[PDB]
Amino acid sequence: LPPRPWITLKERDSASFTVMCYNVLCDKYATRQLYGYCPSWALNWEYRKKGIMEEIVNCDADIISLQEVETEQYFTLFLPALKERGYDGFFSPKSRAKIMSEQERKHVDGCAIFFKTEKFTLVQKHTVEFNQVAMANSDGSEAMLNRVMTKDNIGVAVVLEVHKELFKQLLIVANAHMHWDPEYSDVKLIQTMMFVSEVKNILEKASIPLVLCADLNSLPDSGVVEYLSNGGVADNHKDFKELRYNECLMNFSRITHGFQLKSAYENNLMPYTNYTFDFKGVIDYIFYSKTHMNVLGVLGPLDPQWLVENNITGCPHPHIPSDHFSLLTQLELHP
Ligand SMILES: Nc1ccn([C@@H]2O[C@H](COP(=O)(O)O)[C@@H](O)[C@H]2O)c(=O)n1
């Protein structure tokens, strides 16, 4: 497996730091039924976690956003190992409000944000529960209650002090993992607007640059990517499927947001971020405040001719420990 190439897009000169975004594929979902093309010994977590930790250590990012972090693995694998690489972290599982056994609680996955303490100091941490926010804004929309409220997905966000020696400067890093089902573009879009409007509220109770990492489960042509990329979306966008023109959506505000985000990866520089037999596409993203930061570089994709040479039609694989590829970008923050 050849190393992935680092790409220089723009020359330095402010502070520069790297951000990784990575869905590690949790053990619960790494099954023969979903990934029958991958041998069971290569799906097993005691094997796969080595490649996952290797990928994270090699990327060596100043800030790390992970999805599908299982609760117990956060406390016994990721955080203890990354603490030795100079990180602290913030984790939150999905499904905190759901009743379940002690054993099941250990295996619920969530989102984690790690940051190197020599460069950042955590000032606030927050968990955004999409089901609670949907429920609180569901008046007059059966679809909000039936379709959006019933999905357990979350995002997390931290407010960080960017240390002066990298140049009281603050940055917000947000990390979310949206509902997956392709028949539910309305849920994905509403979850995205809910997350962005709740992050905006985090600002006020604290303008400030944003780095938004997420497994959006949304292709680049989607309503969520347009919403994140153009600062808003019409309320009658087709991804709402009806109720398009519903008034409850304006609570998250045409529905607009004041951020001015661009994607760190822009022109299918990676042709996909999720790579399985049945589905290949870009559904993972790193967005940043374009009026505050430049992109100085990104980590290019795994050489596709190698995947071709080795007849690899889906991941994970004995030498690729997730069905997602990591995203890694170096940003340059300007006061
Ligand atoms: N537009 C989209 C986005 C995701 N998906 C499905 O969701 C899967 C991704 O799941 P996760 O991102 O939650 O791991 C894909 O492999 C695919 O089966 C889809 O079928 N259509």
Closest ligand 1 atom to residue 185 Cα is 1
Q: 302-326 burial, b for 16+ CB within 10 Å, e for fewer? A: beeeebeeeebebbbbeebbbbbbb
CB 289 within 8 A of CB 172: no
Q: Is 322 in the pocket of ligand 1 (CB under 6 A)?
A: no
Beta partners for 281? Answer: 274
Q: How far apart are CA 294 and CA 107, in angstroms?
A: 38
Going from the Cα of 218 to the center of ligand 1, the distance in angstroms, rounded, reads: 8
Q: Is 283 in the pocket of ligand 1 (CB under 6 A)?
A: yes
Q: Give the residue from 56, 16, 69, 59 showing the smallest Cα distance to 211.
A: 16
Using the Cα atoms of residue 67, residue 72, residue 78 and residue 83 in order, give the sign of their dihedral: positive
How many domains would you assign to the chain? Answer: 1
CB 192 within 8 A of CB 216: yes
Could you give the strand order of the β-sheet that contains 261-263, starting from the edge strand earlier in sequence? 120-129, 154-162, 169-177, 210-215, 284-289, 261-263
Q: Give the residue from 122, 134, 125, 157 showing the smallest Cα distance to 259.
A: 157
Burial class (CB in 10 A: 0-12, 13-18, 19+), 204: exposed
Experimental technique, in short, is X-ray
Asked if omega into 304 is within 30° of 0 (cis), the reply is no
Q: How far apart are CA 211 and CA 64, in angstroms?
A: 11
Q: How far apart are CA 28 and CA 32, in angstroms?
A: 11
- The three-class DSSP label of residue 308 is helix
Q: Which residue has the tokens 């979310």?
A: 176
Strand pairing class (169-177; 210-215):
parallel
Residues 210/216/221/227 CA torsion (nearest 10 deg): -40
Q: Give the residue from 287, 222, 238 showing the smallest Cα distance to 261.
A: 287
Going from the Cα of 135 to the center of ligand 1, the distance in angstroms, rounded, reads: 25
**Catalytic residue list contains 215:** yes
- Start-to-end CA distance of the chain, whole Å, equals 40
The secondary structure element, H or E, covering residue 327 is strand 327-333
Range of the domain at 89: 1-335
Residue of 215, 239, 284, 323 marked catalytic = 215
Quoted resolution (Å): 2.1
Q: Is 215 in the pocket of ligand 1 (CB under 6 A)?
A: yes
Q: Give the residue from 36, 39, 104, 116 showing the smallest Cα distance to 70.
A: 104
CB 162 within 8 A of CB 169: yes
CA 290 from centre of chain: 18
The protein residue whose alpha carbon is closest to atom 10 in ligand 1 is 180
CB 217 within 8 A of CB 188: yes
Closest ligand 1 atom to residue 278 Cα is 18
Helices 223-230 and 185-204, axial angle in degrees (round to 10): 30
Q: Give the residue from 219, 330, 266, 321 showing the smallest Cα distance to 1.
A: 321
| Residue 230 CB coordination number (10 Å) | 12
Q: Is 41 in the pocket of ligand 1 (CB under 6 A)?
A: no
Q: Give the residue from 108, 105, 152, 101 showing the smallest Cα distance to 130.
A: 152
Residues in the chain: 335
| Residue 43 CB coordination number (10 Å) | 21
Beta partners for 265? Answer: none
CATH number, residue 57: 3.60.10.10
What is the tally of helices (H) and strands (E) in the chain?
A: 10, 17
Tell me the two tokens of residue 196.
Answer: 């962005």
DSSP per position, 83-134: HHTTEEEEEEES-TTS---HHHHHH-EEEEEEEETTTEEEEEEEEEEHHHHH
Going from the Cα of 131 to the center of ligand 1, the distance in angstroms, rounded, reads: 20
Q: How far apart are CA 176 and CA 111, in angstroms?
A: 7
Going from the Cα of 30 to the center of ligand 1, the distance in angstroms, rounded, reads: 14
Asked if omega into 66 is within 30° of 0 (cis), the reply is no
Q: Is 274 in the pocket of ligand 1 (CB under 6 A)?
A: yes
